[PDB]
Structure formats: C-alpha cells, structure tokens
C-alpha cells in the first residue's frame, strides 16, 4: 500500500479560464476525481489524503498567527471510499487568495509523518497540482529537503503547461511562475538528480503518471 497526499492549488489564479474549455482548477479537480474513482472501483489499498492551499479558511495542525495560512486538510490519510468522491466534488471550490506551496508541502509532510506512524508502506508520496502563480518563501528549504530524504518521501509536480524542451512557443508565464518552475527543478534535482527533473509533468499526463514510480527498498 502507498501513502499519497494530493496537494492541490486552489488559489484565485487557478480559476482564470483561458485555455481550452476548463480552467486549471477545473482540470486539476477532474484529474483528482478520475484518480479517486479509479482507486475506489479497483478496491486499491492505497491511502490517499487531500490538502488544499489557497483556501479562504485555514484548517491544519501547524496553523498559527501568520504561519501555514490558507491551507486546509480536506481528507486525512485513509482509504478512499465511495463516500469521499461526493465529499471531494462538493468541498473542493476555488479559493479567493493565494498560499505558499512550500508551507503546503510542510503540512503534507507533517500529515504523512503523523498518520503513517507504526505502519508499513511501499512508498510515501506527495503529488502537487499548481500553476505556480503564488509567491513562496524559501526559508529553511534545506531542512524541508533533508526531511523529505530522511522520511523517504518522493515528490511529483503537475502543472497546467509544459516546461520541457518541446514546450514550444512562449505561454506568457509570469516571472513568479518562472521562479516557481526553477525552484521546483532545484527541489527535484536535490532529491533525485536528473531523474527527479523527469517527475515534473502536465495535467494531461497526471492521471496515468500518478501510478508509475521506481521501487526503492525501505
């Protein structure tokens, strides 16, 4: 059994609808719903948590004055069940603010650390869905990375646009998004070198890649 956190950006920028027929928020929610439906119908034993960042309210164990704001734990580390699909397609609404994705990553790591205590897993995994529009602080990032390594948590990033060599003409990414892309690459290379950079995907590939990974003895 895997332990997986779906760490979903629901910030205001995700609502802006200008490619295709669906906003980044709608695309990401659709992927999440399809993934959870597959897991339920297949009676998978993987446990799946859901953390939202960019939510108007705050609900997480680390939240205090000016810390880990606008991050909400929507689903704890449990088996997905039929009843959750309804719960997801009702309490996943777009937020009106932005939040710090490294704060959201820490909340997700803390969730895994507490809720995997005393149990055996094939892997511990965090999958981030975001357009990287929101500012973030790199304070103590080196400790975040150290702890990801120590706990043997792997990371995957899913973005609504390509960033690889075939990405083609420019997509009008903001400087903040370009900074977010660069920091994602630094994090993934810190964790697994060139192979980690390969774990940055688009929304279009997310449903299928969420299941694929390299086995590492724990």
């Amino acid at each position: 059994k895997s332990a997986v956190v779906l760490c979903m950006d629901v910030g205001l920028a995700m609502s802006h609808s200008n490619q295709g027929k669906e906003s980044p928020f709608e695309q990401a929610k659709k992927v999440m719903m399809l993934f959870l439906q597959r897991q339920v119908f297949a009676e998978s034993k993987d446990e799946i948590a859901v953390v939202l960042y960019g939510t108007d309210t705050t609900d997480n164990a680390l939240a205090r004055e000016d810390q880990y704001e606008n991050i909400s734990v929507h689903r704890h580390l449990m088996l997905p069940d039929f009843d959750l699909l309804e719960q997801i397609e009702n309490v996943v609404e777009p937020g009106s603010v932005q939040a710090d994705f490294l704060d959201a990553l820490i909340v997700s790591m803390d969730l895994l650390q507490k809720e995997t205590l005393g149990k055996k897993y094939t892997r511990l995994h965090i999958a981030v869905f975001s357009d990287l529009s929101s500012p973030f602080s790199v304070d103590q990032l080196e400790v975040i990375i150290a702890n990801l390594k120590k706990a043997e948590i792997t990371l995957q990033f899913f973005l609504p646009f390509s960033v690889d060599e075939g990405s083609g003409p420019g997509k009008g990414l903001s400087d903040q998004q370009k900074e977010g892309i660069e920091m994602v690459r630094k994090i993934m290379f810190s964790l697994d070198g060139e192979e980690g950079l390969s774990e940055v995907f688009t929304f279009r590939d997310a449903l299928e890649r969420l299941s694929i990974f390299k086995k590492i003895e724990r």
Binding site: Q67, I106, M109, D110, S137, D139, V143, I144, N147
Partner: peptide
C-alpha cells in the same frame, strides 16, 4: 525573506 517555523519533529537531530 518570510520566516517560517517548522514543526519540532523536522528539527530533530
């Protein structure tokens, strides 16, 4: 840079 406070378990030696 905005300072964050990490949970104690992340600061353990």
């Amino acid at each position: 840079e905005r300072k964050r406070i990490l949970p104690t378990w992340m600061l353990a030696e």
